[PDB]
Enzyme design. Structure first.
Site, PDB file in Angstrom:
ATOM      1  N   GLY A   1       8.345 -30.929  -4.537  1.00  0.00           N
ATOM      2  CA  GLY A   1       8.422 -30.205  -3.291  1.00  0.00           C
ATOM      3  C   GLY A   1       7.904 -28.800  -3.450  1.00  0.00           C
ATOM      4  N   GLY A   2       7.543 -28.185  -2.334  1.00  0.00           N
ATOM      5  CA  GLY A   2       7.045 -26.832  -2.384  1.00  0.00           C
ATOM      6  C   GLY A   2       8.177 -25.900  -2.760  1.00  0.00           C
ATOM      7  N   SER A   3       7.841 -24.633  -2.953  1.00  0.00           N
ATOM      8  CA  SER A   3       8.822 -23.630  -3.299  1.00  0.00           C
ATOM      9  C   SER A   3       9.711 -23.383  -2.090  1.00  0.00           C
ATOM     10  CB  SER A   3       8.118 -22.342  -3.692  1.00  0.00           C
ATOM     11  OG  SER A   3       9.063 -21.307  -3.872  1.00  0.00           O
ATOM     12  N   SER A   4      10.992 -23.150  -2.350  1.00  0.00           N
ATOM     13  CA  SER A   4      11.978 -22.915  -1.296  1.00  0.00           C
ATOM     14  C   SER A   4      12.187 -24.138  -0.406  1.00  0.00           C
ATOM     15  CB  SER A   4      11.580 -21.712  -0.440  1.00  0.00           C
ATOM     16  OG  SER A   4      11.656 -20.520  -1.200  1.00  0.00           O
TER      17      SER A   4
ATOM     18  N   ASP B   1      11.296 -24.771 -13.626  1.00  0.00           N
ATOM     19  CA  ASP B   1      11.790 -23.410 -13.813  1.00  0.00           C
ATOM     20  C   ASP B   1      12.407 -23.278 -15.194  1.00  0.00           C
ATOM     21  OD1 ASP B   1      11.161 -22.319 -11.235  1.00  0.00           O
ATOM     22  OD2 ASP B   1      12.887 -23.386 -10.412  1.00  0.00           O
TER      23      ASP B   1
ATOM     24  N   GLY C   1      13.990 -26.425  -1.090  1.00  0.00           N
ATOM     25  CA  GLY C   1      15.383 -26.807  -1.258  1.00  0.00           C
ATOM     26  C   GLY C   1      15.723 -27.669  -2.465  1.00  0.00           C
ATOM     27  N   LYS C   2      14.750 -27.908  -3.342  1.00  0.00           N
ATOM     28  CA  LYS C   2      14.963 -28.738  -4.526  1.00  0.00           C
ATOM     29  C   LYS C   2      16.166 -28.421  -5.403  1.00  0.00           C
ATOM     30  CE  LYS C   2      10.888 -28.520  -6.407  1.00  0.00           C
ATOM     31  NZ  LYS C   2      10.213 -27.709  -5.376  1.00  0.00           N
ATOM     32  N   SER C   3      16.300 -27.180  -5.854  1.00  0.00           N
ATOM     33  CA  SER C   3      17.426 -26.820  -6.716  1.00  0.00           C
ATOM     34  C   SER C   3      18.778 -27.222  -6.167  1.00  0.00           C
ATOM     35  CB  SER C   3      17.423 -25.325  -6.999  1.00  0.00           C
ATOM     36  OG  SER C   3      16.332 -25.004  -7.841  1.00  0.00           O
TER      37      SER C   3
HETATM   38  N1  LIG Z   1       3.663 -25.556 -10.397  1.00  0.00           N
HETATM   39  C1  LIG Z   1       4.760 -24.611 -10.023  1.00  0.00           C
HETATM   40  C2  LIG Z   1       5.692 -24.400 -11.120  1.00  0.00           C
HETATM   41  C3  LIG Z   1       6.796 -23.520 -10.921  1.00  0.00           C
HETATM   42  C4  LIG Z   1       6.988 -22.851  -9.666  1.00  0.00           C
HETATM   43  C5  LIG Z   1       8.118 -21.773  -9.458  1.00  0.00           C
HETATM   44  O1  LIG Z   1       7.556 -20.468  -9.621  1.00  0.00           O
HETATM   45  C6  LIG Z   1       8.892 -21.812  -8.101  1.00  0.00           C
HETATM   46  C7  LIG Z   1       8.085 -21.390  -6.873  1.00  0.00           C
HETATM   47  O2  LIG Z   1       8.989 -21.476  -5.709  1.00  0.00           O
HETATM   48  N2  LIG Z   1       9.540 -23.118  -7.904  1.00  0.00           N
HETATM   49  C8  LIG Z   1      10.813 -23.300  -7.489  1.00  0.00           C
HETATM   50  O3  LIG Z   1      11.646 -22.459  -7.140  1.00  0.00           O
HETATM   51  C9  LIG Z   1      11.165 -24.849  -7.446  1.00  0.00           C
HETATM   52 CL1  LIG Z   1      12.790 -25.141  -7.934  1.00  0.00          CL
HETATM   53 CL2  LIG Z   1      11.084 -25.204  -5.726  1.00  0.00          CL
HETATM   54  C10 LIG Z   1       5.979 -23.114  -8.564  1.00  0.00           C
HETATM   55  C11 LIG Z   1       4.885 -23.999  -8.783  1.00  0.00           C
END
Ligand SMILES: Nc1ccc([C@@H](O)[C@@H](CO)NC(=O)C(Cl)Cl)cc1
Ligand SMILES: Nc1ccc([C@@H](O)[C@@H](CO)NC(=O)C(Cl)Cl)cc1
Ligand SMILES: Nc1ccc([C@@H](O)[C@@H](CO)NC(=O)C(Cl)Cl)cc1
Ligand SMILES: Nc1ccc([C@@H](O)[C@@H](CO)NC(=O)C(Cl)Cl)cc1
Lengths: 178, 178, 178, 178
Positions: A10-13, A37, A15-17
């Site tokens: 899923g994209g950032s934010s 992360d 809600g995955k975590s």
């Molecule tokens: N490929 C990629 C790897 C890590 C990340 C993180 O910096 C970050 C961006 O929101 N990801 C998260 O918070 C995920 Cl838990 Cl949704 C984003 C993209």
């Protein structure tokens, strides 16, 4: 046929975590969580800007070099090996390369019983959350909201735009074969 | 003969985390870090008091059940598999069972090229640091300062009582075969 | 008539922090944030269980002694003094004593121009969020969801059950006289 | 003659935070802590790069605009007001402007009973700690190690180069009139 590894994209934010923390609380057997992360954290800080390893553009952009890709590969094989060893593994990643990223994961998972979950969220809504969470690199939520799913095949799909985390966790748990 | 995995053992507040961050900064090739703390984090929160999984006594005491031990085993095999896959792995743990714990690790590592590091620190000095760090479960530093090393064989030994982290990192890096 | 201090009251996990971060991002003039959490942090760790200072029951319960109440009073006067000195102050608290708590705040604020915001959220919904956030003392969200508002008079009321943080921030900002 | 406010000044990574946590644990009466870090946190995130508010150069450099200075002033008066209200206040800051900064603080403190503490640490040693702590903006420790003290008058001076935090806390507590 019992599920060995759950993989959320899923994209950032998006809600995955929060879903992952809910799944851990919902599912009866203990599941280990290892997102992208936690990988970034296990890498040296220098690896974080010194080209070759991940770099965040001021416009919420992300680029991955080969140094990073090599480490990520070894890590991938390690978590798969954990599943194979009998541990239950949840993994939340961000398929920046759409299907390419999924293919890359398939090559590591092999014939392991996996649940491919897709976590969707409205780009504008996800960006608002990015702001409320205090994220530093603003711009990612919107930039990743849709592309990360292109050509990616899921076994389940939740949308956190109007559903709570605990709820998406319930829809996902119901597809986990004990 | 090139070193694949570095394994540090030491009591709480002995200074392990800071050495690990220094090693990551010192060593030229990117090393992934995975301590016992990151494991605790990958486990469900319930797993944290609900017997079967780790429990902290108010006197800085720690006890590990079988639920926890099983998960820890799978995790151990995963990090070893990461090394075997070509990643460089640093691991900081707390050998509560002295030699027993080391034997347990040896069974997983197999014939992999490992560096057994020992991080020592004065019990009273470590307890003062526990206080300055804002740790919650006070009492551990002192309780683990010496027992965790009993019967454990190291390839290197640093003492953070009078030496800085960056310095212990240098003494350790010098024993890493590229 | 220009607003000097914004004061939000709401149960735990009701969404207060996220609104505060959104308000800071939305409002054109820089606003300082000081919740009850930042106060807890400014207090000595011992103050955190050693009676006289706040204590969390295993059932999500909270009790405040006099030691704590005295410190809280001095702090209250300090933030008010910051407003009076010309700074813009946002404050998120948890009126455990309903109207009593509001009266206590009124005695400190004096004749300062204040915006009394009320942040509501469904008890069950708030408890789900408590779980997704990884909060330790589970049980508070539900225990505080409704009582904290009893007899409390607001100038604005937002409900985060079905509205996003960024949205409740907009409804609140619209009542701020520059 | 009873001490109302303790004010520590020192470069980054000089060890201030840890002494403050130790003082809180050592001193019998509850003391509230409010460093410059907690101020940065109470400010809007935008305030953090958008000129007018603090900006970190890639070489560990720091510059403060007027927007920031105005907020800082109001905050200063608030903490002083907390002391005056009867709370005990510890404050750790970084006198980037040497004596100028101290004069600025004197104007706010007034005739309040203050303890001016100076926390020194070797520039190279402080920079090593900066690395072990995982700080992002590397370079500050060294850049601030000495200048922040120029022309500043202390009532006590501790050097964390060879003394532990808990120890510097003891030397400082001994100068606190109850
Ligand atoms: N490929 C990629 C790897 C890590 C990340 C993180 O910096 C970050 C961006 O929101 N990801 C998260 O918070 C995920 Cl838990 Cl949704 C984003 C993209
Ligand atoms: N067996 C064991 C596992 C984890 C822990 C942790 O709670 C904690 C105690 O200080 N350990 C650390 O901080 C290590 Cl990095 Cl020294 C202590 C002991
Ligand atoms: N009176 C009171 C003071 C502090 C607290 C906190 O522990 C905590 C409980 O959720 N509060 C928060 O997270 C607020 Cl920001 Cl909603 C709860 C109640
Ligand atoms: N004037 C100034 C204000 C805040 C800061 C912080 O970024 C930071 C730099 O190390 N300070 C600290 O960690 C202090 Cl507790 Cl030593 C540095 C300088």
């Amino acid at each position: 046929m019992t599920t060995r590894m759950i993989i959320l994209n899923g994209g950032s934010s998006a809600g995955k975590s929060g879903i992952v923390r809910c799944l851990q609380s919902v599912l009866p057997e203990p599941w280990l969580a290892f997102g992208v992360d936690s990988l970034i954290e296990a890498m040296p800080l220098k690896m974080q800007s010194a080209e070759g390893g991940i770099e965040f553009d001021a416009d919420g952009g992300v680029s991955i070099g080969p140094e990073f890709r090599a480490l990520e590969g070894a890590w991938a094989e390690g978590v798969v090996a954990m599943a194979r060893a009998g541990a239950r593994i949840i993994i939340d990643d961000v398929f920046l390369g759409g299907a390419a990223a999924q293919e890359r994961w398939r090559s590591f998972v092999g014939d392991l019983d996996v649940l491919w979950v897709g976590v969707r969220c409205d780009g504008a809504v996800a960006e608002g959350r990015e702001t409320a969470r205090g994220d530093r690199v603003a711009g990612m939520a919107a930039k990743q909201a849709y592309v990360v799913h292109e050509g990616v095949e899921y076994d389940v799909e939740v949308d956190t735009t109007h559903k709570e985390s605990i709820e998406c966790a319930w829809a996902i748990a119901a597809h986990v074969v004990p």
